[PDB]
PDB file of C-alpha atoms and ligand atoms in Angstrom:
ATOM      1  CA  UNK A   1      61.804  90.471  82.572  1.00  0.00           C
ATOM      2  CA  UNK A   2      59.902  89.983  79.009  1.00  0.00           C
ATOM      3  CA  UNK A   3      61.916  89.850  75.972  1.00  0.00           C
ATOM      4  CA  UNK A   4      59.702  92.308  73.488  1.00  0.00           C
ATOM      5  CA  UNK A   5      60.056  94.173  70.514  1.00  0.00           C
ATOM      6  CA  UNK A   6      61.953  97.989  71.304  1.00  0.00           C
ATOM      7  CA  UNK A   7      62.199 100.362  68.499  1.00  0.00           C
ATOM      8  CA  UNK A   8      63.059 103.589  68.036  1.00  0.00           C
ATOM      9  CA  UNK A   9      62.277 106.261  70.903  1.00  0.00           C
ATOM     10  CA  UNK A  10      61.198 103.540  73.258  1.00  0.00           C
ATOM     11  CA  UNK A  11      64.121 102.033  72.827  1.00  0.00           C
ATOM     12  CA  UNK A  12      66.503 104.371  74.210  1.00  0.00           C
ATOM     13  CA  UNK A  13      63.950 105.318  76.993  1.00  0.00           C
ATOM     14  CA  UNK A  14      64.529 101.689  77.931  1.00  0.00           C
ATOM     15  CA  UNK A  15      68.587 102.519  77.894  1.00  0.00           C
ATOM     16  CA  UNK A  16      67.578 105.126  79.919  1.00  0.00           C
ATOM     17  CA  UNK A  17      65.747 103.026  82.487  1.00  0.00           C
ATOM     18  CA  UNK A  18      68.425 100.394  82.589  1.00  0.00           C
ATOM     19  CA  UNK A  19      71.369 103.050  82.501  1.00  0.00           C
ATOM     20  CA  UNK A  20      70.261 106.039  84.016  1.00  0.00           C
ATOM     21  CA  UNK A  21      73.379 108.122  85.662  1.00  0.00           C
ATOM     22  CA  UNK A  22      75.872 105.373  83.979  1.00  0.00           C
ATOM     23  CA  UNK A  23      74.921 106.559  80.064  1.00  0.00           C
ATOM     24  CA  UNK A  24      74.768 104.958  77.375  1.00  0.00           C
ATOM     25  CA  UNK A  25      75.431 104.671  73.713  1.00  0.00           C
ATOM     26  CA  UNK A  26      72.666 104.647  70.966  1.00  0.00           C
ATOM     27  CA  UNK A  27      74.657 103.473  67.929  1.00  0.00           C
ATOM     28  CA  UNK A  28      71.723 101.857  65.661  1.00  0.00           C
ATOM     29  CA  UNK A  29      74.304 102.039  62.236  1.00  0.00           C
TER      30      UNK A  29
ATOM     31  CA  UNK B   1      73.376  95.620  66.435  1.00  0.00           C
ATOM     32  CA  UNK B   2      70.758  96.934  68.820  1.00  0.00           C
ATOM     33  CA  UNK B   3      68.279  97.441  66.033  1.00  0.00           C
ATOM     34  CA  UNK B   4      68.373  93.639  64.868  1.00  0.00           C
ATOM     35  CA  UNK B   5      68.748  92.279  68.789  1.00  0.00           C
ATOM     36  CA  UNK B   6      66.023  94.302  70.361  1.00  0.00           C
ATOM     37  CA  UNK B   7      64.054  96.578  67.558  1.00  0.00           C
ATOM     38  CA  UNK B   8      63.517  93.611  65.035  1.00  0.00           C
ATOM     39  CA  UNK B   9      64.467  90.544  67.518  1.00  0.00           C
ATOM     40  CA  UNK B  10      62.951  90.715  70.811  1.00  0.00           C
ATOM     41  CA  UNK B  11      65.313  91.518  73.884  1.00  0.00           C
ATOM     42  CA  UNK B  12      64.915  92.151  77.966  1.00  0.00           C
ATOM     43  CA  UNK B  13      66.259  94.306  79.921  1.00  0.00           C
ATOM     44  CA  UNK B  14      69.678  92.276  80.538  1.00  0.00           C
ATOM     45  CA  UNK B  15      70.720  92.714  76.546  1.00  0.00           C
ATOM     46  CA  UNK B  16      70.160  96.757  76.785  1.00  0.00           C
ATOM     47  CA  UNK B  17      73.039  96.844  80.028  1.00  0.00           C
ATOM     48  CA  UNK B  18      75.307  95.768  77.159  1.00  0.00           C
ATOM     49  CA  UNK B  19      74.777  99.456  76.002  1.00  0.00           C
ATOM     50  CA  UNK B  20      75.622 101.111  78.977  1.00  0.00           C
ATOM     51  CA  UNK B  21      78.987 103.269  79.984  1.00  0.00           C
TER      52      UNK B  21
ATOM     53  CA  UNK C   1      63.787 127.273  68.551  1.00  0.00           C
ATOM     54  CA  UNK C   2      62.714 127.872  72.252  1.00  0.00           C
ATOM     55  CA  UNK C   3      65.428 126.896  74.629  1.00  0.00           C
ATOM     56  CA  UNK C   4      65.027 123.755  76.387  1.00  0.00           C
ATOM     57  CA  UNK C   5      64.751 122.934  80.470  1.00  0.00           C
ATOM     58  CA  UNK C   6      65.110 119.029  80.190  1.00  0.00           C
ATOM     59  CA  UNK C   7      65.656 116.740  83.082  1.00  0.00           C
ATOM     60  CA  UNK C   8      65.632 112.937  83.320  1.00  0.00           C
ATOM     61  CA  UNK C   9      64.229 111.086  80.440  1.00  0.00           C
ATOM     62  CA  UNK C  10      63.109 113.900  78.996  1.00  0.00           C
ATOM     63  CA  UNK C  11      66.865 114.796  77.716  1.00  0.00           C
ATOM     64  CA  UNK C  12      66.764 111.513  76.006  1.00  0.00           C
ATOM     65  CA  UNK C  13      63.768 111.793  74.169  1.00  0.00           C
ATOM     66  CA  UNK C  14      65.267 115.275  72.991  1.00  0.00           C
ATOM     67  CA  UNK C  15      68.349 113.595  71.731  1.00  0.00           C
ATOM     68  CA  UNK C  16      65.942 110.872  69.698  1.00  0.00           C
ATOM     69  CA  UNK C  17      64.423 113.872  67.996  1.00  0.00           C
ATOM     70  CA  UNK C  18      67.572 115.618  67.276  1.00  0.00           C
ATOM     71  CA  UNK C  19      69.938 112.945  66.026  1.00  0.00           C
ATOM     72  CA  UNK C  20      67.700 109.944  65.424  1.00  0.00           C
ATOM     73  CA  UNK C  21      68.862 106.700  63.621  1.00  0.00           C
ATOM     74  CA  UNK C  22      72.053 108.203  63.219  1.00  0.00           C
ATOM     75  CA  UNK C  23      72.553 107.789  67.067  1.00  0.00           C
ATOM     76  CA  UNK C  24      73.909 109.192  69.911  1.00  0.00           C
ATOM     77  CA  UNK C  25      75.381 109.616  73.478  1.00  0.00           C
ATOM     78  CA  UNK C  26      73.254 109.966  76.449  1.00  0.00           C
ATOM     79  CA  UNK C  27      76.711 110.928  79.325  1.00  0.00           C
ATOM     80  CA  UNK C  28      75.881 112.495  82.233  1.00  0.00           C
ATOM     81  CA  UNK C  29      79.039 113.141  84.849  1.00  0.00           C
TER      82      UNK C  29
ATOM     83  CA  UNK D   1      77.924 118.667  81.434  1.00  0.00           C
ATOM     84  CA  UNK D   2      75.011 118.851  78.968  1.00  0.00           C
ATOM     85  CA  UNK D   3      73.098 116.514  81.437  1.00  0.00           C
ATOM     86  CA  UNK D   4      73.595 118.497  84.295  1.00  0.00           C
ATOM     87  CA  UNK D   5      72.742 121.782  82.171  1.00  0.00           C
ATOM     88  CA  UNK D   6      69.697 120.739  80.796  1.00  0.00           C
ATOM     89  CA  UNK D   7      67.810 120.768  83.835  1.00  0.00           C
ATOM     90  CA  UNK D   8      69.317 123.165  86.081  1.00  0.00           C
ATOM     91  CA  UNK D   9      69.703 125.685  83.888  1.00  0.00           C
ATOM     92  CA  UNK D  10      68.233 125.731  80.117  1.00  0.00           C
ATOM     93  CA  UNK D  11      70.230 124.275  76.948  1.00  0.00           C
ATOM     94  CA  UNK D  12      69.861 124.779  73.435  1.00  0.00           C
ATOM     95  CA  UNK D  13      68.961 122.120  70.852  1.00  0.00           C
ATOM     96  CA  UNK D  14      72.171 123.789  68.881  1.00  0.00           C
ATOM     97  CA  UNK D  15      73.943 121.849  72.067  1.00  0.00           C
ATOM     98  CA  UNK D  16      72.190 118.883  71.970  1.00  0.00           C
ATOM     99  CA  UNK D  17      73.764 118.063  67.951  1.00  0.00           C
ATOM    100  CA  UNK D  18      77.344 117.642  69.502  1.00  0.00           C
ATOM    101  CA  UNK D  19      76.119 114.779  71.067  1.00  0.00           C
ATOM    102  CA  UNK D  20      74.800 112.360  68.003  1.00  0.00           C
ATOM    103  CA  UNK D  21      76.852 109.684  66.352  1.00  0.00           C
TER     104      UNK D  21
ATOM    105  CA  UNK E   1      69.571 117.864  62.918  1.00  0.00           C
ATOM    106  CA  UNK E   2      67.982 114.508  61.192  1.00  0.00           C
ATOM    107  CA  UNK E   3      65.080 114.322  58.988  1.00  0.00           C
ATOM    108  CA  UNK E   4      62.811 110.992  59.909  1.00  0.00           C
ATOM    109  CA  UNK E   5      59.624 109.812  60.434  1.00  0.00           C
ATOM    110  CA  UNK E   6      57.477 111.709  63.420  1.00  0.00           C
ATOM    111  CA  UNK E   7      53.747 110.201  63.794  1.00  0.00           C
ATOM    112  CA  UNK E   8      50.885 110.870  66.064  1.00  0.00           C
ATOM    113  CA  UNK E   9      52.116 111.036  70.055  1.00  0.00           C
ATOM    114  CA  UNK E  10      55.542 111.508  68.748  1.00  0.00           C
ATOM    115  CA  UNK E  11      55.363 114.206  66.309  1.00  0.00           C
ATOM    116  CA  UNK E  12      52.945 116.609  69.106  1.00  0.00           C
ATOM    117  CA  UNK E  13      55.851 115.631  71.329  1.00  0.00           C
ATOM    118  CA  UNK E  14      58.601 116.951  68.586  1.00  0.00           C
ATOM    119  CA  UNK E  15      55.902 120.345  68.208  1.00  0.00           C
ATOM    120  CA  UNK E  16      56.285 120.852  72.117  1.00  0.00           C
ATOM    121  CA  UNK E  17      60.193 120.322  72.149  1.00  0.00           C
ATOM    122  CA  UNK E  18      60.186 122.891  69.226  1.00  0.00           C
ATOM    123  CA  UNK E  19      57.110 125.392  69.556  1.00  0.00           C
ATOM    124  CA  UNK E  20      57.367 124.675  73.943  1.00  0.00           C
ATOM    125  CA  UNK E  21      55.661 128.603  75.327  1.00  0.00           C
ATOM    126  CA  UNK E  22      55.024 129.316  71.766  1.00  0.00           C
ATOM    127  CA  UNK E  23      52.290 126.883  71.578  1.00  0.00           C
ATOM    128  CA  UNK E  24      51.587 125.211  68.169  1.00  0.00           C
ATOM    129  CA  UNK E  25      48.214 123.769  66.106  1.00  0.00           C
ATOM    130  CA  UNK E  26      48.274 120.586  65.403  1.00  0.00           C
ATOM    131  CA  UNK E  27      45.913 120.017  62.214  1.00  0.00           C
ATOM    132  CA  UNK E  28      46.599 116.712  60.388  1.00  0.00           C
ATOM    133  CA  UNK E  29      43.043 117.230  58.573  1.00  0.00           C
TER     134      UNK E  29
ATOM    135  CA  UNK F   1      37.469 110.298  84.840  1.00  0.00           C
ATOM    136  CA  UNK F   2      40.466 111.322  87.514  1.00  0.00           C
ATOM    137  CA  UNK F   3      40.839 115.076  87.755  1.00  0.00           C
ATOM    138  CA  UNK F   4      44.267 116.061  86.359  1.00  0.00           C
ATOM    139  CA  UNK F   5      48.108 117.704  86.916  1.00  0.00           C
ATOM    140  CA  UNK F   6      49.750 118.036  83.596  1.00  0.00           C
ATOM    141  CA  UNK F   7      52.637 119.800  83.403  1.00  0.00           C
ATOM    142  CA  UNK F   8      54.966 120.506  80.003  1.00  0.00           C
ATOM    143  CA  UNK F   9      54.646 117.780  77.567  1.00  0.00           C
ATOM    144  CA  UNK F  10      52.231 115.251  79.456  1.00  0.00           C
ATOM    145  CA  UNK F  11      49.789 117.755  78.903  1.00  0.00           C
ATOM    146  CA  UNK F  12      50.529 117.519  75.096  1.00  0.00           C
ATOM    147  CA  UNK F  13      50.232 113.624  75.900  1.00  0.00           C
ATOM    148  CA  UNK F  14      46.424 114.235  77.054  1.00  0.00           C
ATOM    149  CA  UNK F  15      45.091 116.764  74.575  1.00  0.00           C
ATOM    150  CA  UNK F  16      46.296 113.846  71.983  1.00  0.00           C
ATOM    151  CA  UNK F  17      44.911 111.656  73.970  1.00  0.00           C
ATOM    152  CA  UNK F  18      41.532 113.855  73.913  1.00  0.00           C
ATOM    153  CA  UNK F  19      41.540 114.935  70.131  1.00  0.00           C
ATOM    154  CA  UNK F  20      43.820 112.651  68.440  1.00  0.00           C
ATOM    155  CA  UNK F  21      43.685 113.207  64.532  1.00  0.00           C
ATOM    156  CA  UNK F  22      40.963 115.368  65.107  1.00  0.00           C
ATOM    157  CA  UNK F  23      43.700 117.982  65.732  1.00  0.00           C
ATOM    158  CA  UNK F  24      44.560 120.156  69.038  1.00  0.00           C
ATOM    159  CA  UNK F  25      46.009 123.548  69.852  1.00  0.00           C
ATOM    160  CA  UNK F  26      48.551 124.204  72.271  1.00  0.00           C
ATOM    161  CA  UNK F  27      47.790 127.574  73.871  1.00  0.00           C
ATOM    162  CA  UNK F  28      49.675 128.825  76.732  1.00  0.00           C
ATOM    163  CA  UNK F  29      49.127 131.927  78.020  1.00  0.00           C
TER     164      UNK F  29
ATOM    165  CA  UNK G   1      44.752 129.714  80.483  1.00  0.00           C
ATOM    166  CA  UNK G   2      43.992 125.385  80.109  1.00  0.00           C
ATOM    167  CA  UNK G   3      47.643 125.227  80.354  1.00  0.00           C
ATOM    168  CA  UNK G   4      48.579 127.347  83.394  1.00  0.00           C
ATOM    169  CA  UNK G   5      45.451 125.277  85.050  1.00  0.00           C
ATOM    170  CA  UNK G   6      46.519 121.900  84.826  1.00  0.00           C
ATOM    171  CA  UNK G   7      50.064 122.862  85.923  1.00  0.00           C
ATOM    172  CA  UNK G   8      49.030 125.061  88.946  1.00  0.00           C
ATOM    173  CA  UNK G   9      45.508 123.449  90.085  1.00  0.00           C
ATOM    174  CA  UNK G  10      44.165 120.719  88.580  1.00  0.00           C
ATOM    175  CA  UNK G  11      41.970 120.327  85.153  1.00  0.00           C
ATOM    176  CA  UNK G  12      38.985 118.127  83.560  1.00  0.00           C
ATOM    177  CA  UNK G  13      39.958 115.679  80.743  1.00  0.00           C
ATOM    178  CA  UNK G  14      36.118 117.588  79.810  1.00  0.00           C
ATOM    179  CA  UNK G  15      38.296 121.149  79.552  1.00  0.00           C
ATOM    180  CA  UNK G  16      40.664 119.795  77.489  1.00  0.00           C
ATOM    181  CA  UNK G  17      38.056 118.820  74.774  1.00  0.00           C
ATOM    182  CA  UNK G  18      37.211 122.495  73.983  1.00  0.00           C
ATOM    183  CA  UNK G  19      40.541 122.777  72.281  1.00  0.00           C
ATOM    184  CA  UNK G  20      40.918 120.240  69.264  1.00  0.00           C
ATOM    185  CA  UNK G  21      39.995 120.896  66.158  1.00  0.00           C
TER     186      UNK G  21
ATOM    187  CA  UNK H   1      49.897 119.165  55.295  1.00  0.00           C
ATOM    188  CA  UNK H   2      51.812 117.798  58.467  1.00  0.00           C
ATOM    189  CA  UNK H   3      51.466 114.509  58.062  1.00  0.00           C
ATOM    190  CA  UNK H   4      52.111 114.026  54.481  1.00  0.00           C
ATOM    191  CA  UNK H   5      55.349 116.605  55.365  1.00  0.00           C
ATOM    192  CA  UNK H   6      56.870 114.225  58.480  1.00  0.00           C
ATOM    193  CA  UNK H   7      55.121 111.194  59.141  1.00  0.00           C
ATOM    194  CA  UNK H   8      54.308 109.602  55.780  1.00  0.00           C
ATOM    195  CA  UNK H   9      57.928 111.529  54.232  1.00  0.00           C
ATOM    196  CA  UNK H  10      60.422 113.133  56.462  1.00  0.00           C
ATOM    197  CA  UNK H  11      60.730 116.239  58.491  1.00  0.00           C
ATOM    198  CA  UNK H  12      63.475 117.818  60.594  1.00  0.00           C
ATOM    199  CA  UNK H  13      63.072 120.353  63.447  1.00  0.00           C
ATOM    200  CA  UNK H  14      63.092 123.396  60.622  1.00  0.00           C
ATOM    201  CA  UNK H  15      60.124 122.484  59.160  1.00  0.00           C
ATOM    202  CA  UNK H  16      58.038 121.972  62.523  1.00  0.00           C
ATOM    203  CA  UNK H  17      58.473 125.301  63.313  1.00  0.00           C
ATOM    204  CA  UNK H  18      56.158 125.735  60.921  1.00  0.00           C
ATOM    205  CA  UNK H  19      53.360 124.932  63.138  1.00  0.00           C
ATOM    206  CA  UNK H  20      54.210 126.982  66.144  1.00  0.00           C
ATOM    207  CA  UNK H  21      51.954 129.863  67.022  1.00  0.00           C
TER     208      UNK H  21
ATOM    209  CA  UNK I   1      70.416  97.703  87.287  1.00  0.00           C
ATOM    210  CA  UNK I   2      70.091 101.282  87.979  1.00  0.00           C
ATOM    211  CA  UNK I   3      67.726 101.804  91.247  1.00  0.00           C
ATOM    212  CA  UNK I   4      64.738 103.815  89.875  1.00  0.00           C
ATOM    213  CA  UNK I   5      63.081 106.954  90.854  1.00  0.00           C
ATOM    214  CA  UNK I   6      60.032 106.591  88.970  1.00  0.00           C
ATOM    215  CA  UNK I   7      57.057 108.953  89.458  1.00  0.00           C
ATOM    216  CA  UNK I   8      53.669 109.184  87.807  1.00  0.00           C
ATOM    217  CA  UNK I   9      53.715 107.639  84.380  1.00  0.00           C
ATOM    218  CA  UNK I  10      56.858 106.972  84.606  1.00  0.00           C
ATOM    219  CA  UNK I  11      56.545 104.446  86.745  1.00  0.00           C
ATOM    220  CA  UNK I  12      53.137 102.530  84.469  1.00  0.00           C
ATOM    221  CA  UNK I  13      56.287 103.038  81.378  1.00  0.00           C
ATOM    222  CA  UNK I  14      58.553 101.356  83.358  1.00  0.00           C
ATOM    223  CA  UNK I  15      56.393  98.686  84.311  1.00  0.00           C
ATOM    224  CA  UNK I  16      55.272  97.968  80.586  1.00  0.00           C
ATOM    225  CA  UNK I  17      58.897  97.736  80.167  1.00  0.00           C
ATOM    226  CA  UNK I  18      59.788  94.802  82.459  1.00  0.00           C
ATOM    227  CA  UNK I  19      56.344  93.126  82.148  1.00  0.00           C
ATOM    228  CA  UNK I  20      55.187  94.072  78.397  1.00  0.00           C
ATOM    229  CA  UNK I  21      52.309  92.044  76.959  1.00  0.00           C
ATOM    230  CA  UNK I  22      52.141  89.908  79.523  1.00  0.00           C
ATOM    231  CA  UNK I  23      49.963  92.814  81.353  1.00  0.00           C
ATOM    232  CA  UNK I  24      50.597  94.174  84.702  1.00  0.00           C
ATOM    233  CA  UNK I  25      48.982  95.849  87.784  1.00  0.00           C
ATOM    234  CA  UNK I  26      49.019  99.307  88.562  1.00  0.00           C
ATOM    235  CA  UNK I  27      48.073  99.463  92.050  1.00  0.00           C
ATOM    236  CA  UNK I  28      48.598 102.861  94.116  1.00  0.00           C
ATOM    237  CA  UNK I  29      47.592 102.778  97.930  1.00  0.00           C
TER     238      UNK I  29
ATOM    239  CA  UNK J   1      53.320 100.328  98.258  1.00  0.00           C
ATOM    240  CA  UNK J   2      55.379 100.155  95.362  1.00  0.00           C
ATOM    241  CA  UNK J   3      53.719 103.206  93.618  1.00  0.00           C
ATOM    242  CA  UNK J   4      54.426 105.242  96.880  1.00  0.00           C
ATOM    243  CA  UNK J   5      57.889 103.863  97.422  1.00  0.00           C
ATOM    244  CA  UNK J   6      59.253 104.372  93.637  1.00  0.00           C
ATOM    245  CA  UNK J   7      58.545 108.194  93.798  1.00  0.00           C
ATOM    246  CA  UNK J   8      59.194 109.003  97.703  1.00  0.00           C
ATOM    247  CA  UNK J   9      62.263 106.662  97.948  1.00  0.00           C
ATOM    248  CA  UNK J  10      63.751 104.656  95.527  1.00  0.00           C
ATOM    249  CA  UNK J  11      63.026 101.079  93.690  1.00  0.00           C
ATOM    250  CA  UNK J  12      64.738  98.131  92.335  1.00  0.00           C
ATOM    251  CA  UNK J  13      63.478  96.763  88.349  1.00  0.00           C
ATOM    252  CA  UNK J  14      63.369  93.669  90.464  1.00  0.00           C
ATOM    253  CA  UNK J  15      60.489  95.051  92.459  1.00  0.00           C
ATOM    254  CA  UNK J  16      58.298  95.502  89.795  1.00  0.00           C
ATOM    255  CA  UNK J  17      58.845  92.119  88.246  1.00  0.00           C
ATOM    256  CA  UNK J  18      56.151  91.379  91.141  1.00  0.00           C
ATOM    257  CA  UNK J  19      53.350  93.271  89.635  1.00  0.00           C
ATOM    258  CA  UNK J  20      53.456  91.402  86.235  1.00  0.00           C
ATOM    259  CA  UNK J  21      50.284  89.238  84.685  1.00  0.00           C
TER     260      UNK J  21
ATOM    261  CA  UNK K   1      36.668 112.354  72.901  1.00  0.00           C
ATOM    262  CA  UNK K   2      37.873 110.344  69.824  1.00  0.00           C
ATOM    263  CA  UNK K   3      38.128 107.014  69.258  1.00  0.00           C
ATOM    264  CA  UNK K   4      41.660 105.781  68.183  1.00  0.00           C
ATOM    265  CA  UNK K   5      44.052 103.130  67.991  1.00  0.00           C
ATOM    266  CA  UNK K   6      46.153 102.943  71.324  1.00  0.00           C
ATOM    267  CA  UNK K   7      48.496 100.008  71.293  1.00  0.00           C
ATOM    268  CA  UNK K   8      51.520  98.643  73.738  1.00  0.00           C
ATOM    269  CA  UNK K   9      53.108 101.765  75.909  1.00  0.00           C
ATOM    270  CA  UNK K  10      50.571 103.955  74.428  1.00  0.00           C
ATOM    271  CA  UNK K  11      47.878 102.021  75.585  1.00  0.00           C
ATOM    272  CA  UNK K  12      49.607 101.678  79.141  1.00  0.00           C
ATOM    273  CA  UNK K  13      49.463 105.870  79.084  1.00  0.00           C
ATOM    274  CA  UNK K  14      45.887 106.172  78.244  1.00  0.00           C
ATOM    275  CA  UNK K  15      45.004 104.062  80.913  1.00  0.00           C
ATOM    276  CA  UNK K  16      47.003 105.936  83.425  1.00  0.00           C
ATOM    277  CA  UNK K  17      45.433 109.217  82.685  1.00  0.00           C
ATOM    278  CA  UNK K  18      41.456 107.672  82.467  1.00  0.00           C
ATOM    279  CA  UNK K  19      42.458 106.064  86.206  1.00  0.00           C
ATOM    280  CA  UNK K  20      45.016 107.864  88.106  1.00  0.00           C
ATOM    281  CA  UNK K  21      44.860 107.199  91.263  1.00  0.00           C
ATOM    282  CA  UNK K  22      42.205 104.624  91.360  1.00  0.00           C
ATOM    283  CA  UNK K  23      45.038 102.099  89.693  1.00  0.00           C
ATOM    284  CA  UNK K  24      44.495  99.894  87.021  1.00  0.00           C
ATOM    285  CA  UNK K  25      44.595  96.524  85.000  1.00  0.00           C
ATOM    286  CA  UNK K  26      46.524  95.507  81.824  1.00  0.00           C
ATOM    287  CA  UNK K  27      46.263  92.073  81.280  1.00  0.00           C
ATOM    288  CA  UNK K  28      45.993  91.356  77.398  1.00  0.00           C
ATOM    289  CA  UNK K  29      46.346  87.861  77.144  1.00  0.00           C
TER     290      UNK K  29
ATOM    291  CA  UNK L   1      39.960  91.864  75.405  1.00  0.00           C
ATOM    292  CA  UNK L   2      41.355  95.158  75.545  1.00  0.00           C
ATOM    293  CA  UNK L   3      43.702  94.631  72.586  1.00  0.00           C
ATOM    294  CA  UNK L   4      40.968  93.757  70.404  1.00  0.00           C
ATOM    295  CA  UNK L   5      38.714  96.424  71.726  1.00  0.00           C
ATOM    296  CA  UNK L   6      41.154  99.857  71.589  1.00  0.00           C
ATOM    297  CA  UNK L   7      44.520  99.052  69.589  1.00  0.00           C
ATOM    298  CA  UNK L   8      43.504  96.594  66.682  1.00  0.00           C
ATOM    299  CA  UNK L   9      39.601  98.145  66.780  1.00  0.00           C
ATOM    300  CA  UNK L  10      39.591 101.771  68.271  1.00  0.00           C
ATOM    301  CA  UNK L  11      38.273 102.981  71.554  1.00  0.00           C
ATOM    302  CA  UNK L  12      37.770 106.189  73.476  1.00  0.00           C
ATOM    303  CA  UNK L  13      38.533 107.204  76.907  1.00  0.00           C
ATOM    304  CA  UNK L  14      34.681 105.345  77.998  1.00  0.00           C
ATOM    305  CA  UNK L  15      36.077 101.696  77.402  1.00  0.00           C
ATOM    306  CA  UNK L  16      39.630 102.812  79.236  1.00  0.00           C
ATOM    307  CA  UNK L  17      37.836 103.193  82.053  1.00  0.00           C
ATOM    308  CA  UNK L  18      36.554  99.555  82.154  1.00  0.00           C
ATOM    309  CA  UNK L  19      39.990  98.719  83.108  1.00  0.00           C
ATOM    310  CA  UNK L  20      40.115 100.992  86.255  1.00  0.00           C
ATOM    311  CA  UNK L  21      40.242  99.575  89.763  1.00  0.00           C
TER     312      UNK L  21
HETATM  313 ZN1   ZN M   1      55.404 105.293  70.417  1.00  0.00          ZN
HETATM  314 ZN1   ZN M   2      57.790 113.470  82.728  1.00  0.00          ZN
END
């Protein structure tokens, strides 16, 4: 798996790929 | 946080389970 | 607005354009 | 839930606020 | 809801979540 | 090119794709 | 209309050209 | 116009109703 | 991980997102 | 193949770690 | 069509839609 | 390469579909 740079709306599509039906938290601060 | 680990870091997939329920 | 019919990843990238950088909770049951 | 909603019925983006941080 | 930044792909994205069976112009001149 | 289904937003996706900057409308009937 | 078309059937990246601006 | 409104500066929902038909 | 149900795009987005700039193959059969 | 199998079925992120450059 | 920048997942997209079916390469070194 | 040619130069559709199978 590549370590890249994940900002902003692709980042928490990639929380959804990883979490799907689990959920997640988006808490940037 | 996320932001500095993944946004202005680099992270995989492994890093963003840490996020997960 | 026009009501929304959002499955999948689609819900998250609502929730991105709603709350944003102030973050949120994707928690399906 | 709101998950569930969303896509078998409709939901409102007036929901979808009581779910940021 | 937040006020941010919403460019190219993402901001005709935003218009469809918003506008959806209204349809929308998208003009950025 | 492929012949295309577009359904909801991914055919916001191609009409961006199409136009870009140029502009687009979104006209369902 | 284009938009019914590409859902229902199936559409020309050449259709969707007659509608930008 | 748009992009000056919520690319360049910010924009919420309200404003991109603006642009609906 | 979560198993994946990944159709159309979907799957060439999740695919950038494990692979990124190292490039990948998109291969249907 | 994959394609096939990720939308018919279901895949593993470990699956598509095969299709990298 | 116009000529734009497409870069990273965006890129990924556009290449999907041109190819479909036929499948693709990404490989930007 | 493809970079060069469509993300820090622009391209069109016509070059994407150098990189089709
Ligand atoms: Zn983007
Ligand atoms: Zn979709």
């Amino acid at each position: 798996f590549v370590k890249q740079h994940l900002c902003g709306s692709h980042l928490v599509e990639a929380l959804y790929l990883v979490c799907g039906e689990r959920g997640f938290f988006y808490t940037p601060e | 946080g996320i932001v500095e680990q993944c946004c202005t870091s680099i992270c995989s997939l492994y890093q963003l389970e840490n996020y997960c329920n």
